[PDB]
Each structure stands twice: as structure tokens, then as C-alpha cells.
């Protein structure tokens, strides 16, 4: 079939800067190519059709170009609203009318190290049979961050779930929670519980930890 490739998947740009977004087609779609914008919480919005034509009511800072196989969406100067996800779509008479995987445009800011907190499971929860251990990384940039859970110095794998906030509107940072869930029986079999955070703003991994049962 016809495959559309959007590389890079994340563009990190300063407010005000020029944004160039690429779309590559597995075979020639001529000029039958559309661009959409999608902001959080909303249906997508059509920006460009026939590779280079601006859709009605779309501001002049958006423009499309290319034909055949390679395509560019350009935003000549990002406004705050322009930091969202962009998708291309092939518009031929050959279904399916595939979308590319999307490119997210994010604010590029200076590196900011995470603050790390670890929360032991509550006594409330332990009465219920499960132990949740929460590790929090607060207000960091960039988004890439590795948290490795260690239980009595043993690396925990396939055992926790991460979750990440959208880029904050005030200071353009991210926050992340990692949650290790053991059953209460399994929890009481061990003593030292630790999450270990590596990030570009840290010269060395940060480790937060507690011994089960201590204040």
C-alpha cells in the first residue's frame, strides 16, 4: 500500500522560529496530499490540500510544498497555538487514504533537571492487599528520562507503569510519575525500595529510596 513517513516525529523549536515538517510517500502521490493540525482535546483541522493550497480561514504563516514523493509543511513563525501535532494524508483515488504517523512540535527550552520524590505505599492501601510505590519526577526538560526501579538492589522489569504530563504552559517542562505495584505479600518479602533517575540535566543518576517500615 501507500505508506506516509513523517520524520522527525518530534520537532523541538523556539517560540517565533520557522518550522519545517516533512512527509515522505512510499510512491508518487503527485500533489494529492493534505496536512492537518490537531491540538489537545480536539478534532483535527485541515490546513493544506493538494500539497500546496491553503484551506479557507487558515492563517498565512502555514504553507505547503512538494509533489510526487517528498512534501514539506512550513510554518514561517510559530505562534503559541502552533505547538501541536501535524499529520499528512494521501488524497488519491486509491484507498485507504492513509495518514502519516504525526509530528509533534514542542517548545525547545533550556535543560532542567527533575526533582525526584518517592512515596511508600500507604497503610490504607496495605489493608487492601496491594502495595503501590510512586516515584515522581517534577518539572524537567527535555522529555527523555529513564527511571529504573530497584528492589533490594535488584532491577525491576515488567513491573511498573509510567505516565507523563503534557508540556506545561507556564515553564514548558514535563512531569512524570512511575508506579511500581507489588502485592502486599510480595512487598513484605523485601526491605530496600528505590527508583533511579537518569536525565540530561543530571551529571549522575539520582536515587530515592526508603526501607520498608521506617519514617
Amino acid at each position: 500500500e501507500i505508506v506516509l513517513t513523517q520524520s522527525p516525529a518530534t520537532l523541538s523549536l523556539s517560540p517565533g522560529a520557522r518550522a519545517s515538517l516533512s512527509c515522505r510517500a512510499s510512491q508518487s502521490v503527485n500533489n494529492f496530499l493534505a496536512w492537518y493540525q490537531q491540538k489537545p482535546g480536539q478534532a483535527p483541522r485541515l490546513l493544506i490540500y493538494d500539497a500546496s493550497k491553503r484551506a479557507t480561514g487558515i492563517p498565512a504563516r502555514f504553507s505547503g510544498s512538494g509533489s510526487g514523493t517528498d512534501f514539506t509543511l512550513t510554518i514561517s513563525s510559530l505562534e503559541p497555538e502552533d505547538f501541536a501535532v501535524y499529520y499528512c494524508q494521501q488524497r488519491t483515488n486509491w484507498p485507504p487514504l492513509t495518514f502519516g504517523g504525526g509530528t509533534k512540535v514542542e517548545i525547545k527550552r533550556t535543560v532542567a533537571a527533575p526533582s525526584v520524590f518517592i512515596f511508600p505505599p500507604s497503610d490504607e492501601q496495605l489493608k487492601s492487599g496491594t502495595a503501590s510505590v510512586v516515584c515522581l519526577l517534577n518539572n524537567f526538560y527535555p522529555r527523555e528520562a529513564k527511571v529504573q526501579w530497584k528492589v533490594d538492589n535488584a532491577l525491576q522489569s515488567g513491573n511498573s507503569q509510567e505516565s507523563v504530563t503534557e508540556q506545561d504552559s507556564k515553564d514548558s517542562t514535563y512531569s512524570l510519575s512511575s508506579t511500581l505495584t507489588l502485592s502486599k505479600a510480595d512487598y513484605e518479602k523485601h526491605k530496600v525500595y528505590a527508583c533511579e533517575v537518569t536525565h540530561q540535566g543530571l551529571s549522575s543518576p539520582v536515587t530515592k529510596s526508603f526501607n520498608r517500615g521506617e519514617c
Binding site: 490540500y49 479557507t56 484507498p95 487514504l97 492513509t98 512515596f119 496491594t130 507523563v164 510519575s177
Partner: protein, 219 residues
């Protein structure tokens, strides 16, 4: 003026069928120009099906394997999307839309509001909220853990709204069976003085758990 109104959210067991509707309010266009698209949580858009102008009947995404049907009722300006034999993967937001050059200044671009369809062999359940006590061991962090729930929109407030600065409420995760957490940053000095309380206002289960968070002590 012209709008596309879609059916409300649906929860469906695996192997069953769902039928989502899309009604065009204004306008005088043909209902069969309506296309369906979907977006799984945190994923891109996927084209489901619709009528390419050179043909007379809908084409569908081949990976669906024939489980999808799109039907237009001209009488009522309603397009129906029916997806049978629901897989876990079909859980997504489903969008009805009219995009293209059909014959009125530029391309038409009109989208429905979306319809969340959730598929799983799970069943509904209200959540209990466990405190995340600030360590007594500057800036302190404290929070509320909201675990083992189903019906999606679990709203969280802090201090009944009087606290908003520094709050982070994380997007939910799905465990191998069955969680959300919310945290807030505070000055260490306010601990004990200012009383922090989180408000989970789970609207489907009729759950109104208002949990207070305090620092944990010894013996």
C-alpha cells in the same frame, strides 16, 4: 452553522458490535460524503472508510478485515459506522468527518466531536483514593493515588479549587487487569498548618471521595 453531532460514549464487551451515529445539522450536502476516522489513546489518526469520489460505494481499511460497515441515511442526514467482533485494539475515539472538494470556495473541512468507544472484558467500578504523604525527610511534594477504577472521567480538584498552582494530574494508565495519580508541590513550612485535601469527583459511579493528606508520623 453546519455541524456534525455524534453519538455518546460506549462501553462494549469483546466480540460484540458497536454502532456510532453522526447527524448533520445544517447544510445540504449528501450524507454519503461523510468519512470515518479513529484515534487510539496517544496514537495517530487511522482512516477507517468512506467513499472515494470515483466510486459508488464505501472502501474500508483492509486491516479491519471486513468488520466495518458504513451506511448513510439520506432521510435523516445520518451516517452510521458499525464495527463488529470488537478487539481490544478497537478501543479509540471515532470521528465522523467531511473533508474534500465536493462542489460548493476551497475544500470542505467539517468534523464531529468524537465518540469514545472502549472495548474490554472488564466491567465498571468506582475508585478508592490512597494518600501520598509528604516525607518528613525547602519544597515538599504530596499527592493522591486513584486506583482500580473503570468509568473514565475521574476529575480531581485540590482544596475544592483554592489550590491550582503546582498541581499535576497525570493521564491514566491501564494495568494487565483493571489507575491515576495526582500530585502537588508545596513549601515544606506549610505542612501541618495548611490542610491539603484532594477531591475526586467521579461522575459515573457517583463517587465523591474527598481525601485529606497529612505527613506521616512515627509510632
Amino acid at each position: 452553522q453546519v455541524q456534525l453531532v455524534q453519538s455518546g460514549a460506549e462501553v462494549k464487551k469483546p466480540g460484540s458490535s458497536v454502532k456510532v451515529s453522526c447527524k448533520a445539522s445544517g447544510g445540504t450536502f449528501k450524507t454519503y460524503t461523510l468519512t470515518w476516522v479513529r484515534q487510539a489513546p496517544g496514537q495517530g489518526l487511522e482512516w477507517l472508510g468512506g467513499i472515494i469520489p470515483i466510486f459508488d460505494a464505501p472502501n474500508y481499511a483492509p486491516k479491519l478485515l471486513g468488520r466495518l460497515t458504513i451506511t448513510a441515511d439520506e432521510s435523516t442526514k445520518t451516517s452510521y459506522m458499525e464495527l463488529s467482533s470488537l478487539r481490544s485494539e478497537d478501543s479509540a475515539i471515532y470521528y465522523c468527518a467531511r473533508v474534500g472538494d465536493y462542489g460548493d470556495w476551497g475544500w470542505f473541512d467539517l468534523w464531529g466531536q468524537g465518540t469514545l468507544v472502549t472495548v474490554s472484558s472488564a466491567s465498571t467500578k468506582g475508585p478508592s483514593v490512597f494518600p501520598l504523604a509528604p516525607s518528613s525527610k525547602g519544597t515538599a511534594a504530596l499527592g493522591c493515588l486513584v486506583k482500580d477504577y473503570f468509568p473514565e472521567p475521574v476529575t480531581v480538584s485540590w482544596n475544592s479549587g483554592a489550590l491550582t498552582s503546582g498541581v499535576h494530574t497525570f493521564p491514566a494508565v491501564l494495568q494487565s487487569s483493571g489507575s491515576l495519580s495526582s500530585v502537588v508541590t508545596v513549601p515544606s513550612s506549610s505542612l501541618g498548618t495548611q490542610t491539603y485535601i484532594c477531591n475526586v469527583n467521579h461522575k459515573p459511579s457517583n463517587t465523591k471521595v474527598d481525601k485529606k493528606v497529612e505527613p506521616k508520623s512515627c509510632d
